[PDB]
Design a protein around this ligand. Structure first.
Ligand SMILES: *[C@@H]1O[C@H](CO[C@@H]2O[C@@H](C)[C@@H](O)[C@@H](O)[C@@H]2O)[C@@H](O[C@@H]2O[C@H](CO)[C@@H](O)[C@H](O)[C@H]2NC(C)=O)[C@H](O)[C@H]1NC(C)=O
Ligand SMILES: *[C@@H]1O[C@H](CO)[C@@H](O[C@@H]2O[C@H](CO)[C@@H](O)[C@H](O)[C@H]2NC(C)=O)[C@H](O)[C@H]1NC(C)=O
Ligand SMILES: *[C@@H]1O[C@H](CO)[C@@H](O[C@@H]2O[C@H](CO)[C@@H](O)[C@H](O)[C@H]2NC(C)=O)[C@H](O)[C@H]1NC(C)=O
Ligand SMILES: CC(=O)N[C@@H]1[C@@H](O)[C@H](O)[C@@H](CO)O[C@H]1O
Ligand SMILES: CC(=O)N[C@@H]1[C@@H](O)[C@H](O)[C@@H](CO)O[C@H]1O
Ligand SMILES: CC(=O)N[C@@H]1[C@@H](O)[C@H](O)[C@@H](CO)O[C@H]1O
Ligand SMILES: *[C@@H]1O[C@H](CO)[C@@H](O)[C@H](O)[C@H]1NC(C)=O
Ligand SMILES: *[C@@H]1O[C@H](CO)[C@@H](O)[C@H](O)[C@H]1NC(C)=O
Lengths: 99, 49, 50, 150, 40, 50
């Protein structure tokens, strides 16, 4: 109204979250997949507690990786190929393995 | 009040709770601050006389 | 026949199909039971209470 | 007349992990051999806690905010802590309550108290006997009182 | 119409509908088919 | 197609007042998501089988 600019509207980011784990007996490690989002928005919303759900304790370490289905937090990328244990999407595969 | 009528299909009104059933003795062990027990689906399962 | 017997003695995953059948049926019944506790906007979930 | 302990040190608040403590029975109804999922006020696991300590000259009696609910735990060798006091203004302006493990009888009251700045119980070393209870100068508009059994 | 990103600019529309991608990408499928024709 | 749906944006969207009403129906759309995710996994299995 004030300047007769034309402005678009679009929604704030949303999606599903799902948890990747090896067996509980083997270890308590987890990796989190945020589906169909660019990591810049979720990292800039984890910091300063803008995301929800809000864990009491967690951290995004240096391990952040981008995939077509979304981006994984807490998983380390590797430049080698193996047979799939847990399929993620778009060709990205996961497993629990030695460093 | 009335006496109890165990092992027969009867109407029962123990304490504001109503239904029909077969009363039998039990081996529950209530704490002194618990008067009722419940199963899943919120059905009453046992009562303290 | 010996090697197949040892495999069956130690494996757990080989029968996942039959296990999935059992789990599917049990989960379905569990859900149908749990629905009784819902309220559907009634003043209470307990029929005899009302 | 209130007695003020001079030369008392300021406290050194200390941090500890509470670990998993603080779970309590959510409801009276009996249940067995089942997993139950419920929402209520609870103490979250591995939350930090503010430790306090009375040793030698040190004596800490600091007003602590309530935040609509507190956990509490004490480690005592010979009944050092006798109870608590709950109030909002504690200056002749708001109802206050006292809970104390008096040796003769437990006493709970909810009346205007005007509690002494440094309330305490007086004891003698060789006799092991209590001599004074300097908790409150007076009490007016008293509307509640309770006494436990002897 | 629905939210999707092909490339990766990801956009999302108020209706909340979404389309997930396939696991096997088209060049991996074409490598299976060329392996079959080659071996046969 | 292997499509997916989000329950709260479609039925209730931005508002919170409507979500406090949808709460009275319980688990229903969550088993819905469970179903539609099973269909999604099945499509991948079909292609890997062929
Ligand atoms: C501990 O308290 C008891 C009882 O509480 C007293 O009575 C309450 C109504 C209130 O006025 C408290 O402040 C009081 O202390 C005390 O024992 C009482 O002593 C009086 C005589 O002083 C006697 O008339 C009461 O019957 C007693 N009450 C009993 C026996 O239950 C006691 O002195 C307090 N202190 C100690 C160290 O025990
Ligand atoms: C009951 O609680 C209310 C709110 O928790 C108290 O009101 C506060 O009083 C202080 C006194 O200085 C004000 O600074 C605050 O702004 C008030 N509101 C809040 C939210 O803190 C009230 O004092 C309590 N009752 C009594 C008798 O003290
Ligand atoms: C609670 O109220 C009493 C009485 O109103 C206060 O006692 C007064 O104290 C002042 C100075 O301390 C004296 O000048 C007055 O003469 C006292 N009043 C009476 C009637 O003797 C008492 O101080 C109040 N509590 C606090 C903590 O201030
Ligand atoms: C199914 C199962 O229990 N698997 C292993 C078990 O063989 C092993 O003894 C244990 C050691 O902690 O780790 C777990
Ligand atoms: C005589 C003497 O010094 N007694 C104690 C001392 O043992 C202790 O180490 C110190 C602080 O802990 O407080 C005082
Ligand atoms: C951070 C920013 O402004 N834009 C990025 C873009 O550079 C990146 O290619 C894309 C990934 O899909 O995520 C967004
Ligand atoms: C726990 O430490 C945090 C800082 O990490 C602080 O904000 C909080 O007040 C502490 N909890 C206490 C003192 O109970
Ligand atoms: C008790 O309270 C009344 C009003 O509630 C007040 O008039 C009276 O002065 C109080 N009693 C005292 C101060 O002793």
């Amino acid at each position: 109204p004030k300047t007769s600019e034309i402005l678009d509207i679009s929604p704030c980011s949303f999606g599903g979250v799902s948890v990747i784990t090896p067996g509980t007996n083997a270890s308590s490690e987890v990796a989190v997949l945020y589906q169909d989002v660019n990591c810049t928005d979720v990292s800039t919303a984890i910091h300063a507690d803008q995301l929800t759900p809000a864990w009491r304790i967690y951290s995004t370490g240096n391990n952040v990786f981008q995939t077509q289905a979304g981006c994984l937090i807490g998983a380390e990328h590797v430049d080698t190929s193996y047979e799939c244990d847990i399929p993620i999407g778009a060709g990205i595969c996961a497993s629990y393995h030695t460093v | 009040s009335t006496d109890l009528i165990k092992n027969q299909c009867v109407n029962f009104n123990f304490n504001g709770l109503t239904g029909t059933g077969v009363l039998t003795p039990s081996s529950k062990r209530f704490q002194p601050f618990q008067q009722f027990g419940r199963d899943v689906s919120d059905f009453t399962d046992s009562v303290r006389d | 026949i010996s090697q197949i017997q040892e495999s069956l003695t130690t494996t757990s995953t080989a029968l996942g199909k039959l296990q999935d059948v059992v789990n599917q049926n049990a989960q379905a019944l569990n859900t149908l039971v749990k629905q009784l506790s819902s309220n559907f906007g009634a003043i209470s979930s307990v029929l005899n209470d009302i | 007349r209130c007695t003020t302990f001079d030369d008392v040190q300021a406290p050194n608040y200390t941090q500890h992990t509470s670990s998993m403590r603080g779970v309590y029975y959510p409801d009276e109804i009996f249940r067995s051999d089942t997993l139950y999922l419920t929402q209520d006020l609870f103490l979250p696991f591995y939350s930090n806690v503010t430790g306090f300590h009375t040793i030698n000259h040190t004596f800490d009696n600091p007003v602590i905010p309530f935040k609509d609910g507190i956990y509490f735990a004490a480690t005592e060798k010979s009944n050092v802590v006798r109870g608590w006091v709950f109030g909002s203004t504690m200056n002749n302006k708001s109802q206050s309550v006292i809970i104390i493990n008096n040796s003769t009888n437990v006493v709970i009251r909810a009346c205007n108290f005007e509690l002494c700045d440094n309330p305490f119980f007086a004891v003698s070393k060789p006799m092991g006997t209590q001599t004074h209870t300097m908790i409150f100068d007076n009490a007016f508009n008293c509307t509640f009182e309770y006494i436990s059994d002897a | 119409q629905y939210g999707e990103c092909l490339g990766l600019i990801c956009a999302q529309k108020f209706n909340g509908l979404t389309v997930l991608p396939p696991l096997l990408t088209d060049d991996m499928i074409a490598a299976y088919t060329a392996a079959l024709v080659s071996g046969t | 197609a292997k499509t997916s749906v989000d329950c709260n944006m479609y039925i209730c969207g931005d508002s919170t007042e409507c979500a406090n009403l949808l709460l009275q129906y319980g688990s229903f759309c969550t088993q819905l998501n469970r179903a539609l995710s099973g269909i999604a996994a099945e499509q991948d299995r079909n292609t890997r089988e062929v």
